[PDB]
Design a protein around this ligand. Structure first.
Ligand SMILES: CCC1=C(C)/C(=C/C2=NC(=C\c3[nH]c(/C=C4\NC(=O)[C@H](C)[C@H]4CC)c(C)c3CCC(=O)O)/C(CCC(=O)O)=C2C)NC1=O
Ligand SMILES: CCC1=C(C)/C(=C/C2=NC(=C\c3[nH]c(/C=C4\NC(=O)[C@H](C)[C@H]4CC)c(C)c3CCC(=O)O)/C(CCC(=O)O)=C2C)NC1=O
Ligand SMILES: CCC1=C(C)/C(=C/C2=NC(=C\c3[nH]c(/C=C4\NC(=O)[C@H](C)[C@H]4CC)c(C)c3CCC(=O)O)/C(CCC(=O)O)=C2C)NC1=O
Ligand SMILES: CCC1=C(C)/C(=C/C2=NC(=C\c3[nH]c(/C=C4\NC(=O)[C@H](C)[C@H]4CC)c(C)c3CCC(=O)O)/C(CCC(=O)O)=C2C)NC1=O
Ligand SMILES: CCC1=C(C)/C(=C/C2=NC(=C\c3[nH]c(/C=C4\NC(=O)[C@H](C)[C@H]4CC)c(C)c3CCC(=O)O)/C(CCC(=O)O)=C2C)NC1=O
Lengths: 162, 66, 99, 99, 160, 162, 160, 162, 160
């Protein structure tokens, strides 16, 4: 995985170029948002269990069939695995938010995820709905400025799964 | 029997490592009985000197309960 | 004028022109970055269990994630291996015996 | 013949485990360059999530005992040896009495 | 990078980033503009630094450009100065990254094998890196010179 | 693995046959070539570093983009891995020549190499070019008959990769 | 502390501390007087903070002090306020140390098992520490309040 | 390990006290010494290989028999191990000086060093002489004030070894 | 030696030595007499080999004995020749052993760290070893030169 700094470093390395004005512009842009990202990351970390609570409550309210018998989230085991997955998504979305890059989402989360869910019978659309629900809860938690920029990575996960 | 308490020094000959290796050279560990032959053979093959081995859990000479 | 030509070392190290599709593939080409973007957990400390409790705990959870491929809190691995973790912390056993 | 625990012990009591991981480090993906095909097979295994696939990545290794054709008896230095053995046989023949 | 290192560590223990890691990233991000200024200063003078370092190196090591030397000739001297340019670029990348990781990952691991295959003398490389360090720390102030010399010393120790 | 002796043994073991005159002739031919094979192996072993240096020099002269920034052999890791693969090819070609049999080339070199390289983005045509440059360097050092023999194993590698 | 974390990070890679770690340690030391002042502020108002936090906790969670609650009765309510006092002292320790390490190794490691042995509900703990966050950060200025709120938020997320 | 701050925190935790005036005073003392400690640690970090060179040169000049055949530092492996141990002692003394407390020396360096050296045959007296030689060299570089502070931990290592 | 390698390989498989391994040991003991003759020949020509090897090294690399060179001075040049004598003794040990294992155990493991600490240039080592190889092979016949030069080649590769 690469953060924004290493993203610029890697593009200029594979082009064999020294940093030009555009590179320093992107680097300034990353450094300018670093406090926002760090504060949002700390807020999300302190309230991770809460976010999972409201997001799973919303997902199971809108889709009661998931946790009733015959649903993919019907057992204590499969319910716990669903909330574990939601914790995965929140934690890695916070990683991507801190890094300012979606590379970790491709490398560490989305790789093999669709085929694994298809192999397990996990509903992918319902998982996308749960990810969206985490998006609204986290946005309500961290404020609009951080909300949009966390939503970038949430919708990246949603699009990668869909 | 079921348990040997083994204190062993394993020096290094193949190379000098960047790692500290004070962890791995002089040690004491608990190896269960039917692992001890293999473990002792491996320690002897690495070049170490087995300093002591003791009975801790079981009773020597027991027939049942092994 | 005093013309100043481009030094030869500049041209000796230039790269072929690459659009974004080639840049992306040139970044991610060889062995994956996971090979060097990771932590290797080992029992470097020989001090007692009273201090450096957190690094023993991290090593124990890393052992769980390596042997069982992920966290296994749903299966109560901590209480299943509580005696084993206790022997590891007080240094009765090594990492290999824990594994 | 022996089941599961003897099999795990056979792995962990191997010389390879002792040299690579010793007694202190948690195992990890090694990205092995050797032997041949170990890298792709290991990477397929380590790029899969838990329960991602139940298929066997390495069912077995195709034997290389015998190919079809290319006997290598037409090999030029093999041809030279077959020429030289004729000379050796001729010398042995002239070692016999002339009659 | 510092942020990448923090995220990799936090991912290893499968946890969120600690307040200490967040404070570390806060510090690294607070010093971003200063490090960008240092890197831009080094970048604006790549040609001067490379030429002066090459002169100092070949005065220390005249044999490398003598006939039968490794850098003998215009094109081989150009390849030598190009290697110096590569390492200057990695040093600037490391300055903006906040650690030696770009230098480590592009120009250090397996460098003795590469130069052994290129019949390039390692002490010559050490002299060239020290020459670059002197020239480049010349163009900076006291505070920036120590930080840049840290990366240069890392590279020099890696070479020998 | 197999050598010439083991190949004759296997072909007479599948038939459950004791050795005939033909098998003894094949064994004599191999025993006659053994001295030349050992000579070539010793020469190659003494000169492996020279061969790798020269062959990689021709390869990177013809394909300069491999060592320009962004090329597959551009970093110290990837250059070192490239010359390490060349050393591997030389070593296993020497093993094969000493055995008189290409089975080791399939078993310990060619098995999964193609999709190893394809999964890494290693160019296969440039690897074959490196192998051909290595063959040309080795032929000059081992002499004409040994050059022809060594070309067989280098060409086996090149054809298996292609 | 921050110094201990930097030393352990350097030791894991088996190296001397990089200029980044030394600069972080310099910044930590330069912030020492301010953090001792913050800790002294929170320490001198220990009784105010504990009683206001306990009042808010019982207002928002009356079931704790109702029959069948873990804090019902005089002695149980006293030991509840006593644990609040422990956690406040741990927060001051974390403030002076610059990280959450004192809190982590005195009050977080094994807290779930301890409150499971005592029937102490963890939502009650998190609500108590959030009430104590509000009460304590009310007394501090913005720069002090945010930095103390980091420790309180870490505590709340660790109990939850 | 514990530093000075963690030592004060632990001594106040054991008695269950909030910080009083004396604790803040000891803290202020440490933050007063902090700049000196950081400067000395950076100086030693820049000059580690040097200090090791003069320290080993002094040890072997004063005790030449250690490196002639029969000495425990006689081989490339054993000489390399000796200088490796000296580098470890310098690095950990620097850690202890920066921390301001000698717990790291007992926790990491001295825990089991007697058993290991005596079983290996390492002479303790010569290693102590090497500690003193390293201390004398380091004091010349760090500065007059920081020299005594670093000597504190050097004598701690020596007495633990002695 | 060869016997020790055969024994450890057999013990790795927990077996007796196969007829092939026994035949290998038989060939080894057959070659032993020629090996001792070669080692005797190099042992007799101690001072010659050292003298010409040192002279060729110092003429080929005057910088080593020149001011600022690592071997400047009578005592440092004596230490240089002493190292050459060490390595020639190791090569004799390798000749008797039949392999480079004694050279490996006494003078190759950790040699780069030793010469880094001593500030000894490794290319100077390689050139001194090549000069020793030239003198030793010259003092030998055509047959002995190959097997003796193999050990010097291994040693130079270890230094390089
Ligand atoms: C960090 C990257 C990563 C991801 C993303 C990941 C997903 C993942 N989810 C799994 C199981 C599961 N995941 C779910 C989640 C579903 N339940 C409901 O239907 C929802 C629609 C939906 C969640 C919102 C469920 C129910 C299971 C249990 C499947 C089973 O055991 O049969 C598994 C199988 C192994 C295990 O349980 O640990 C994986 C690998 N694993 C990873 O290593
Ligand atoms: C980070 C904490 C730590 C330290 C410092 C440490 C020291 C240490 N020194 C060792 C060996 C050694 N140590 C020495 C050094 C001595 N020989 C000379 O007499 C000198 C006077 C003296 C050094 C000043 C030597 C020569 C050996 C090799 C002994 C052997 O041949 O086995 C070993 C055995 C394994 C190895 O060789 O790597 C350890 C573990 N271990 C640790 O866990
Ligand atoms: C003995 C049989 C065998 C072979 C040959 C083999 C090759 C092999 N080459 C690899 C990587 C590689 N291989 C190359 C080869 C070069 N790329 C350049 O473009 C050239 C065209 C080409 C050589 C002439 C490169 C650049 C890498 C990337 C190394 C990295 O990413 O770190 C890897 C991945 C593991 C590693 O690098 O540690 C393997 C397994 N493996 C085997 O078991
Ligand atoms: C980004 C990391 C990286 C580095 C550093 C790197 C170095 C590198 N230097 C090379 C050649 C060279 N390098 C040098 C430099 C030496 N000449 C003197 O001896 C000096 C001691 C020393 C330089 C200070 C020379 C002279 C050549 C030309 C070799 C020749 O023409 O035969 C080559 C061969 C391919 C080419 O020239 O394009 C590489 C790959 N490659 C990399 O991917
Ligand atoms: C048996 C295996 C073994 C080896 C090889 C060995 C090498 C060795 N060489 C040393 C000194 C030395 N060695 C040299 C030799 C160098 N001078 C020039 O650069 C030349 C390139 C080169 C000689 C060919 C010099 C000059 C010194 C003195 C170092 C000094 O005083 O700074 C020392 C320091 C102790 C002493 O001087 O007695 C050792 C341990 N020790 C061993 O136990």
């Amino acid at each position: 995985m690469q953060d924004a700094i290493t993203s610029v470093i890697n593009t200029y390395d594979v082009q064999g170029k020294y940093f030009d004005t555009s590179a320093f512009d992107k680097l300034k842009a990353y450094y300018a948002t670093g406090e926002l990202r760090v504060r949002a990351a700390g807020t999300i970390s302190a309230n991770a269990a809460t976010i999972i609570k409201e997001a799973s409550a919303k997902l199971f309210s809108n889709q009661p069939d998931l946790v009733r018998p015959g649903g993919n989230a019907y057992t204590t085991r499969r319910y716990a695995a669903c909330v574990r997955d939601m914790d995965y998504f929140l934690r890695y979305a916070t990683y991507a938010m801190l890094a300012g890059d979606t590379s970790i989402l491709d490398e560490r989360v989305l790789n093999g995820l669709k085929e694994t869910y298809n192999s397990l019978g996990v509903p992918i659309s319902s998982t996308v709905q749960g990810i969206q629900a985490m998006k609204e809860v986290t946005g309500s938690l961290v404020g609009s400025g951080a909300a949009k920029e966390m939503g970038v990575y949430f919708d990246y996960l949603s699009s990668g799964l869909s | 029997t079921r348990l040997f308490k083994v204190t062993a020094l394993i020096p290094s000959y193949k190379k000098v490592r960047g790692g500290r290796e004070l962890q791995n050279t002089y040690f004491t560990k608990l190896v269960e009985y039917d692992r001890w032959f293999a473990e002792q053979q491996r320690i002897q093959k690495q070049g170490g000197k087995i300093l002591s081995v003791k009975m801790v859990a079981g009773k020597p000479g027991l027939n049942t309960g092994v | 004028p005093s013309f100043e030509e481009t030094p030869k070392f500049i041209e000796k190290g230039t790269a072929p022109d690459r659009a974004l599709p080639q840049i992306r593939s040139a970044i991610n080409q060889g062995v994956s970055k996971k090979r060097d973007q990771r932590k290797i957990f080992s029992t470097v400390g020989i001090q007692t269990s009273l201090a450096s409790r957190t690094e023993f705990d991290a090593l124990i959870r890393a052992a769980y994630r390596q042997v069982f491929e992920r966290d296994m809190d749903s299966y109560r691995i901590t209480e299943v291996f509580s005696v084993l973790e206790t022997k590891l912390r007080n240094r009765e056993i090594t990492t290999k015996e824990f594994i | 013949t022996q089941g599961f625990k003897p099999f795990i012990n056979a792995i962990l009591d191997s010389k390879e485990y002792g040299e690579v991981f010793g007694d202190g480090t948690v195992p990890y993906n090694r990205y092995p360059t050797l032997p041949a095909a170990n890298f792709p097979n290991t990477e397929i295994l380590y790029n899969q999530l838990t329960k991602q696939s139940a298929e066997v990545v390495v069912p077995s290794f195709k034997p290389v005992t015998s190919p079809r054709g290319m006997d290598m008896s037409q090999t030029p230095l093999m041809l030279q040896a077959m020429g030289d053995i004729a000379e050796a046989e001729q010398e042995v023949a002239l070692q016999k009495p002339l009659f | 990078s510092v942020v990448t290192k923090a995220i990799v560590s936090a991912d290893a223990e499968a946890r969120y980033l600690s307040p200490g890691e967040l404070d570390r990233i806060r510090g690294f991000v607070s010093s971003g503009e200063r490090r960008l200024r240092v890197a831009q200063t080094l970048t604006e003078s790549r040609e001067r630094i490379i030429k002066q370092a090459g002169d100092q190196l070949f005065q220390k090591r005249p044999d490398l450009v003598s006939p039968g030397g490794n850098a003998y000739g215009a094109e081989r001297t150009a390849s030598c100065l190009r290697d110096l340019d590569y390492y200057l670029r990695l040093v600037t990348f490391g300055i903006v990254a906040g650690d030696v990781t770009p230098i480590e990952e592009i120009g250090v691991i397996g460098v003795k094998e590469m130069y052994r295959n290129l019949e390039v003398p390692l002490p010559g490389m050490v002299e060239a890196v020290k020459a670059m360090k002197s020239v480049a720390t010349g163009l900076l102030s006291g505070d920036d010179s120590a930080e840049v010399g840290y990366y240069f010393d890392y590279l020099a120790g890696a070479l020998a």
